[PDB]
């Protein structure tokens, strides 16, 4: 799945179909992406057997479930409220979860794709999400260091800041996982906004 934003109003979408074949759909509207485009890094669209629909596929990932698809179950995949009819550009499941993500971003002081924005405000949003990532990387090691409070902290502390951050992240709680999932989807949103506002 590759969405190319051609200008503020127009995109094309290239998706796998079957065998070695991909299909490119032109005249893809940028206006409504929130209603169709999955923000989750654990999913992407493929072209449906008959070419009318874009259908979700779960990638191999430890990220949380979204859109009511835990893994690839064609009851849900083929179902109308879980896919996007091409040219209609509406996927209720995707829209529903996207909207939670949007509200979260609004709560963090980030600009959102459903309200007005321009290049400057998106750029400021990337500034702010970078700040969130950094603070987060501080908290992750803080929490790991408590756990895991053994006097062998000296061993951990024999590493560089990066190796420490890496080991803490590797070993972290599911809660932390949820924070990074959320932030990844918000990042995807801000990027769609950046591209539309170029």
């Amino acid at each position: 799945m590759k969405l190319k934003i051609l200008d503020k109003d127009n995109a094309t979408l290239n998706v796998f179909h079957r065998n070695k074949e991909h299909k490119t759909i032109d005249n893809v509207p940028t206006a409504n992406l929130v209603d169709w485009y999955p923000l989750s890094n654990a999913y992407e669209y493929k072209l449906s057997r008959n070419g009318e629909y874009l259908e979700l596929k779960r990638l191999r990932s430890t990220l949380p479930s979204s859109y009511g698809l835990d893994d690839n179950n064609q009851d849900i995949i083929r179902d109308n409220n879980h896919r996007c009819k091409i040219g209609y550009w509406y996927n209720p499941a995707v829209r529903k979860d996207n909207l939670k993500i949007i509200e979260k971003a609004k709560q963090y002081g980030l600009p959102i794709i459903t309200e007005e924005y321009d290049a400057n405000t998106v750029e400021q949003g990337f500034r702010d999400i970078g700040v969130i990532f950094q603070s987060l990387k501080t908290i992750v090691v803080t929490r790991y260091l408590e756990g895991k409070t053994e006097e062998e902290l000296r061993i951990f502390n024999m590493k560089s800041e990066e190796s420490q951050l890496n080991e803490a992240l590797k070993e972290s709680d599911f809660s932390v996982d949820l924070t990074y999932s959320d932030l990844g989807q918000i990042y995807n949103m801000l990027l769609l906004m950046k591209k539309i506002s170029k």
Binding site: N41, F133, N166
Partner: protein
Amino acid sequence: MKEQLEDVLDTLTDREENVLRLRFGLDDGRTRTLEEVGKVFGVTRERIRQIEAKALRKLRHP
């Protein structure tokens, strides 16, 4: 290699391109560890590394 990296990203899927944007700090300015990136994608450090390698190989040829 801002333009060349961009031409490469154009040949990747949304997911792979965003792995690399995160990694190289193309949007927020901050480069990220393979572990931060892997956490954002729910994949291992190694898978992120393979994506990065794929991109470097594409970056070399045309």
